[PDB]
Design a protein around this motif. Structure first.
Motif, PDB file in Angstrom:
ATOM      1  N   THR A 192       0.980  -1.026   0.169  1.00 54.16           N
ATOM      2  CA  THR A 192       0.249   0.216  -0.141  1.00 54.16           C
ATOM      3  C   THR A 192       0.979   1.188   0.138  1.00 54.16           C
ATOM      4  O   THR A 192       0.576   2.106  -0.723  1.00 54.16           O
ATOM      5  CB  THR A 192      -1.161  -0.018   1.058  1.00 54.16           C
ATOM      6  N   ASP A 193       2.076   1.139   0.737  1.00 52.67           N
ATOM      7  CA  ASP A 193       2.988   2.357   0.782  1.00 52.67           C
ATOM      8  C   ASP A 193       3.772   2.697  -0.435  1.00 52.67           C
ATOM      9  O   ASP A 193       3.993   3.706  -0.653  1.00 52.67           O
ATOM     10  CB  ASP A 193       3.910   2.270   2.018  1.00 52.67           C
ATOM     11  N   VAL A 194       3.685   1.322  -1.200  1.00 50.14           N
ATOM     12  CA  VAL A 194       4.605   1.654  -2.455  1.00 50.14           C
ATOM     13  C   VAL A 194       3.665   2.618  -3.389  1.00 50.14           C
ATOM     14  O   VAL A 194       4.176   3.598  -4.086  1.00 50.14           O
ATOM     15  CB  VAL A 194       4.546   0.416  -3.250  1.00 50.14           C
ATOM     16  N   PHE A 195       2.540   2.224  -3.384  1.00 51.06           N
ATOM     17  CA  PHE A 195       1.557   3.118  -4.476  1.00 51.06           C
ATOM     18  C   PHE A 195       1.195   4.410  -3.854  1.00 51.06           C
ATOM     19  O   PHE A 195       1.004   5.286  -4.583  1.00 51.06           O
ATOM     20  CB  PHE A 195       0.164   2.092  -4.419  1.00 51.06           C
ATOM     21  N   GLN A 196       0.907   4.538  -2.413  1.00 47.95           N
ATOM     22  CA  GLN A 196       0.841   5.920  -1.892  1.00 47.95           C
ATOM     23  C   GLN A 196       2.055   6.688  -2.237  1.00 47.95           C
ATOM     24  O   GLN A 196       1.838   7.869  -2.527  1.00 47.95           O
ATOM     25  CB  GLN A 196       0.736   5.730  -0.437  1.00 47.95           C
ATOM     26  N   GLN A 197       3.295   6.244  -1.933  1.00 50.00           N
ATOM     27  CA  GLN A 197       4.509   7.185  -2.145  1.00 50.00           C
ATOM     28  C   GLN A 197       4.761   7.339  -3.716  1.00 50.00           C
ATOM     29  O   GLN A 197       5.252   8.353  -4.199  1.00 50.00           O
ATOM     30  CB  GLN A 197       5.584   6.084  -1.890  1.00 50.00           C
ATOM     31  N   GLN A 198       3.991   6.696  -4.499  1.00 51.01           N
ATOM     32  CA  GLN A 198       3.913   6.752  -6.063  1.00 51.01           C
ATOM     33  C   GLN A 198       2.548   7.565  -6.460  1.00 51.01           C
ATOM     34  O   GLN A 198       2.334   7.653  -7.746  1.00 51.01           O
ATOM     35  CB  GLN A 198       4.123   5.631  -6.817  1.00 51.01           C
ATOM     36  N   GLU A 199       1.976   8.017  -5.705  1.00 51.68           N
ATOM     37  CA  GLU A 199       0.726   8.686  -5.786  1.00 51.68           C
ATOM     38  C   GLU A 199      -0.310   8.053  -6.676  1.00 51.68           C
ATOM     39  O   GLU A 199      -0.989   8.470  -7.836  1.00 51.68           O
ATOM     40  CB  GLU A 199       0.888  10.056  -6.522  1.00 51.68           C
ATOM     41  N   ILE A 200      -0.673   6.747  -6.405  1.00 52.08           N
ATOM     42  CA  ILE A 200      -1.216   6.048  -7.313  1.00 52.08           C
ATOM     43  C   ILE A 200      -2.757   5.819  -6.555  1.00 52.08           C
ATOM     44  O   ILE A 200      -2.739   5.160  -5.438  1.00 52.08           O
ATOM     45  CB  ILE A 200      -0.933   4.430  -7.835  1.00 52.08           C
ATOM     46  N   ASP A 201      -3.822   6.530  -7.191  1.00 49.34           N
ATOM     47  CA  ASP A 201      -5.215   6.443  -6.415  1.00 49.34           C
ATOM     48  C   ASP A 201      -5.814   5.375  -6.998  1.00 49.34           C
ATOM     49  O   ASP A 201      -5.449   4.714  -8.099  1.00 49.34           O
ATOM     50  CB  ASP A 201      -5.743   7.867  -6.751  1.00 49.34           C
ATOM     51  N   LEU A 202      -7.132   5.021  -6.667  1.00 44.70           N
ATOM     52  CA  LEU A 202      -7.781   3.784  -6.859  1.00 44.70           C
ATOM     53  C   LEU A 202      -8.345   3.782  -8.497  1.00 44.70           C
ATOM     54  O   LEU A 202      -7.761   2.815  -8.990  1.00 44.70           O
ATOM     55  CB  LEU A 202      -9.198   3.663  -6.245  1.00 44.70           C
ATOM     56  N   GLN A 203      -8.541   4.856  -8.918  1.00 43.56           N
ATOM     57  CA  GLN A 203      -8.597   5.132 -10.354  1.00 43.56           C
ATOM     58  C   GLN A 203      -7.834   4.798 -11.041  1.00 43.56           C
ATOM     59  O   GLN A 203      -7.858   4.188 -12.163  1.00 43.56           O
ATOM     60  CB  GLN A 203      -9.447   6.365 -10.679  1.00 43.56           C
ATOM     61  N   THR A 204      -6.366   5.233 -10.857  1.00 45.49           N
ATOM     62  CA  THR A 204      -5.341   5.076 -11.738  1.00 45.49           C
ATOM     63  C   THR A 204      -4.813   3.532 -11.683  1.00 45.49           C
ATOM     64  O   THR A 204      -4.542   2.986 -12.595  1.00 45.49           O
ATOM     65  CB  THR A 204      -4.023   6.119 -11.273  1.00 45.49           C
ATOM     66  N   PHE A 205      -4.796   2.852 -10.270  1.00 49.51           N
ATOM     67  CA  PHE A 205      -4.508   1.539 -10.324  1.00 49.51           C
ATOM     68  C   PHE A 205      -5.390   0.732 -11.200  1.00 49.51           C
ATOM     69  O   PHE A 205      -4.848  -0.144 -12.032  1.00 49.51           O
ATOM     70  CB  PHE A 205      -4.934   1.143  -8.849  1.00 49.51           C
ATOM     71  N   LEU A 206      -6.759   1.137 -11.467  1.00 47.40           N
ATOM     72  CA  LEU A 206      -7.716   0.412 -11.972  1.00 47.40           C
ATOM     73  C   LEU A 206      -7.441   0.391 -13.722  1.00 47.40           C
ATOM     74  O   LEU A 206      -7.982  -0.476 -14.390  1.00 47.40           O
ATOM     75  CB  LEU A 206      -9.183   0.489 -11.796  1.00 47.40           C
TER      76      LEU A 206
END
Ligand SMILES: [Zn+2]
Length: 61
Positions: free
Chosen positions: A16-30
Protein backbone atom coordinates in the motif's frame (compact mmCIF):
# COMPACT_ATOMS: atom_id res chain seq x y z
CA UNK A 1 -13.61 1.64 0.24
CA UNK A 2 -10.30 2.59 -1.43
CA UNK A 3 -6.97 1.08 -2.52
CA UNK A 4 -5.78 0.33 1.07
CA UNK A 5 -8.94 -1.71 1.72
CA UNK A 6 -8.68 -3.55 -1.60
CA UNK A 7 -5.04 -4.54 -0.98
CA UNK A 8 -5.92 -5.81 2.48
CA UNK A 9 -8.45 -8.16 0.89
CA UNK A 10 -5.81 -9.45 -1.54
CA UNK A 11 -3.06 -9.90 1.04
CA UNK A 12 -1.10 -7.12 -0.63
CA UNK A 13 -1.15 -4.79 2.35
CA UNK A 14 2.61 -4.39 2.46
CA UNK A 15 2.44 -2.75 -0.97
CA UNK A 16 0.00 0.00 0.00
CA UNK A 17 2.83 2.38 0.86
CA UNK A 18 4.56 1.71 -2.50
CA UNK A 19 1.50 2.93 -4.34
CA UNK A 20 0.80 5.80 -1.95
CA UNK A 21 4.40 7.01 -2.27
CA UNK A 22 3.98 6.81 -6.05
CA UNK A 23 0.70 8.75 -5.88
CA UNK A 24 -1.36 5.92 -7.31
CA UNK A 25 -5.05 6.39 -6.51
CA UNK A 26 -7.75 3.77 -6.95
CA UNK A 27 -8.84 5.09 -10.34
CA UNK A 28 -5.30 5.05 -11.71
CA UNK A 29 -4.63 1.60 -10.28
CA UNK A 30 -7.65 0.24 -12.14
CA UNK A 31 -6.16 1.32 -15.45
CA UNK A 32 -2.79 -0.41 -15.00
CA UNK A 33 -1.36 -3.27 -17.08
CA UNK A 34 1.35 -5.84 -16.38
CA UNK A 35 4.00 -3.67 -18.05
CA UNK A 36 3.02 -0.69 -15.94
CA UNK A 37 3.23 -2.78 -12.76
CA UNK A 38 6.75 -4.00 -13.65
CA UNK A 39 7.74 -0.42 -14.51
CA UNK A 40 6.25 0.62 -11.18
CA UNK A 41 8.65 -1.83 -9.52
CA UNK A 42 6.39 -4.72 -8.49
CA UNK A 43 8.90 -7.48 -9.22
CA UNK A 44 7.17 -10.07 -7.04
CA UNK A 45 5.35 -12.16 -9.52
CA UNK A 46 2.54 -13.28 -7.21
CA UNK A 47 1.78 -9.75 -6.02
CA UNK A 48 1.60 -8.68 -9.66
CA UNK A 49 -0.74 -11.59 -10.55
CA UNK A 50 -3.12 -10.80 -7.68
CA UNK A 51 -3.16 -7.08 -8.62
CA UNK A 52 -3.97 -7.85 -12.27
CA UNK A 53 -6.75 -10.18 -11.25
CA UNK A 54 -8.20 -7.46 -9.03
CA UNK A 55 -7.88 -4.92 -11.84
CA UNK A 56 -9.58 -7.37 -14.20
CA UNK A 57 -12.47 -7.94 -11.82
CA UNK A 58 -13.09 -4.25 -11.09
CA UNK A 59 -13.22 -3.45 -14.78
CA UNK A 60 -16.08 -5.97 -15.24
CA UNK A 61 -19.64 -4.97 -14.31
ZN1 LIG B 1 -1.35 -15.30 -15.46
Amino acid sequence: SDLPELFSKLGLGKYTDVFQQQEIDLQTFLTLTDQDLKELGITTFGAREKMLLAISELNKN
